[PDB]
Amino acid sequence: LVKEEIQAKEYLENLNKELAKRTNVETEAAWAYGSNITDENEKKKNEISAELAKFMKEVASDTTKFQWRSYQSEDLKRQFKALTKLGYAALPEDDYAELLDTLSAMESNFAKVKVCDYKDSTKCDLALDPEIEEVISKSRDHEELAYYWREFYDKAGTAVRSQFERYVELNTKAAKLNNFTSGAEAWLDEYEDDTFEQQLEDIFADIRPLYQQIHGYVRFRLRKHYGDAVVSETGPIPMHLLGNMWAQQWSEIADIVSPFPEKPLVDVSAEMEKQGYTPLKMFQMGDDFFTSMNLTKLPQDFWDKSIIEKPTDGRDLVCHASAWDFYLIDDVRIKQCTRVTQDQLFTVHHELGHIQYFLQYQHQPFVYRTGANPGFHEAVGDVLSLSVSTPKHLEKIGLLKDYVRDDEARINQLFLTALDKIVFLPFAFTMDKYRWSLFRGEVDKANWNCAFWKLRDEYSGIEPPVVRSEKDFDAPAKYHISADVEYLRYLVSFIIQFQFYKSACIKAGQYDPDNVELPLDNCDIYGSAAAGAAFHNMLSMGASKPWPDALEAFNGERIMSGKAIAEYFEPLRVWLEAENIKNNVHIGWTTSNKCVS
Ligand SMILES: *[C@@H]1O[C@H](CO)[C@@H](O[C@@H]2O[C@H](CO)[C@@H](O[C@@H]3O[C@H](CO[C@H]4O[C@H](CO)[C@@H](O)[C@H](O)[C@@H]4O)[C@@H](O)[C@H](O[C@H]4O[C@H](CO[C@@H]5O[C@H](CO)[C@@H](O)[C@H](O)[C@@H]5O)[C@@H](O)[C@H](O)[C@@H]4O)[C@@H]3O)[C@H](O)[C@H]2NC(C)=O)[C@H](O)[C@H]1NC(C)=O
Ligand SMILES: *[C@@H]1O[C@H](CO)[C@@H](O)[C@H](O)[C@H]1NC(C)=O
Ligand SMILES: *[C@@H]1O[C@H](CO)[C@@H](O)[C@H](O)[C@H]1NC(C)=O
Ligand SMILES: [Zn+2]
Hints:
Layout: H1 2-34, H2 39-62, H3 74-84, H4 93-112, H5 128-138, H6 142-156, H7 161-177, H8 183-188, H9 196-226, E1 237-238, H10 254-257, H11 269-274, H12 279-292, H13 300-305, E2 322-325, E3 332-335, H14 342-361, H15 374-389, H16 391-396, H17 407-421, H18 424-439, H19 448-460, E4 462-463, E5 468-469, H20 479-483, H21 488-507, H22 529-539, H23 547-555, H24 563-582, E6 595-596
Parallel strand pairs: 1-4, 5-6
Antiparallel strand pairs: 2-3
The structure holds a molecule of 6 linked components (NAG-NAG-BMA-MAN-BMA-MAN), 2-acetamido-2-deoxy-beta-D-glucopyranose (NAG) (2 copies) and zinc ion.
Zinc ion (ZN) is lined by residues 350, 354, 378.
Domain Peptidase M2: 2-590
Main location: secreted
Protein name: Angiotensin-converting enzyme
């Protein structure tokens, strides 16, 4: 048993190196398909996966030759635990292959969607990224908005109903083979905490009132713009008017809903263009930010192998921005169809946060080369993006000119941040509440579409621009739903990124609550080695410890908390509550009529 724990350590040392290498090969094939969708690359990705799944199955089986639960070392027990978790790889060989073909079908459908120009039904090569997204973010013609919404959702959503259904059945069977109740519990296992769901319910209910105030004010402002025929006072907001295809963030309509329209509203897109920014510049600036904090510089493989602009050769590819770890040394990459905008600048930093995490933990053993939990991975880049979005940072890099930071410009910037950060929370909760409710069997197949729009109404108070029914199937019109990417990570990120940002700001000397000149919402952590250090301590851990331990490394705390995100927005809350009362703004909404059962 002592003898045995010593051999086990050697077994792990060696098997970890082998999984890195086999995964490397699967990652390269996935990369090739995602950057160039073809039948041939599909076949290749899916065959290499099939093979890696088969080997994982043998590894799981050989775990039972070791008395690992009897061992002394927490660390060895943790690695063995992690090797027992097969996920889809637990499926019979044939079911696994079917599942991969189902996943390919959906993701490739999403990526190849094209629609006809509203103004020209002969031009039929408009893609979400960038053509349809540009209209949704910029047009204030409600009818054009509605048209693109229907065209998109009909092709990206409804077209893959039968595929989505088989995926739920196979996902459910895979979870049961791992002895989880459903896919919901399989995802939740990543957070290592039996009360996790409850914890988020608690946090969500504490911020909901702020969301409802924001919702109410936006609805008021949209009525003055579009008039009462297009937006009602008491009903859900028509989602097509909120500047995003899924209404997940509303910051693209800030110019019509901002508190003080005569005071400055930060939008540096136009200046980025005026100064000749490219994608390459944007990523080099993101690099600069990380190295400024004494973190690790992008390696050369990054620059040689990343794809940072949409190919011009008319190939099909997944443009949904992503970051990739190849599981060797220093081979990390981003695939981003980058455009020169303010919000793409933030995305660049978002993505490079994943890359940094990968570089920070690449000396760990294979099974620890992932986030402390999924939410940690998503948060890293957003802590930087927070800084980058500040007027402070933006004047430093010359993108924001002639800005005066009076009380009214502060409220504008606060609100603008809230349109991305508070608004998102209900949206993000719903993506997984929906999927969970299907995975767990709580909704009947006859009710699957209206169950989606029900959640969206109940939690976000938004609805489709047109009537939908069980003849439509709208959920897979969101990337992550079509691609089988758990979404809760993003809700977790949006809470915990404030815990990290506040703590990083304190460490940098950029925030003191008792000093009016260092308010949280204008903290820049650029150049702070103090913040950098705290990051290094947490990120270098990988998944070597449960996530509270990784948090504790960063700032000493162990609990996921809503206190920070509220502390950030508290000045907005005060003002906004008062402004809604001042203007007699109706808060809340009636039940949507847009989904017919
Ligand atoms: C998900 O949960 C599943 C249960 O719902 C679970 O499946 C069970 O896993 C067991 C593996 O631990 C497996 O156990 C073996 O059962 C054999 C009996 O088989 C049939 O008879 C049953 C009873 O009447 C029927 O109901 C079943 O359908 C079966 O088909 C036994 O032969 C076998 O035994 C040997 O194995 C143990 C090994 O155990 C340990 O090893 C060390 C030594 O190496 C021991 O010292 C240690 O203390 C411990 O015992 C030996 O003790 C023994 O001498 C033999 O070598 C074994 O018990 C069980 O059949 C299976 N049941 C069911 C209902 O499926 C899945 O494993 C779970 N999945 C995941 C992913 O976790
Ligand atoms: C895309 O993949 C195919 C294989 O199906 C290959 O022959 C083709 O030339 C690739 N395109 C690019 C631009 O890499
Ligand atoms: C930066 O990190 C190094 C290790 O890479 C460390 O020894 C040093 O203290 C840090 N430097 C700064 C600027 O704090
Ligand atoms: Zn991300």
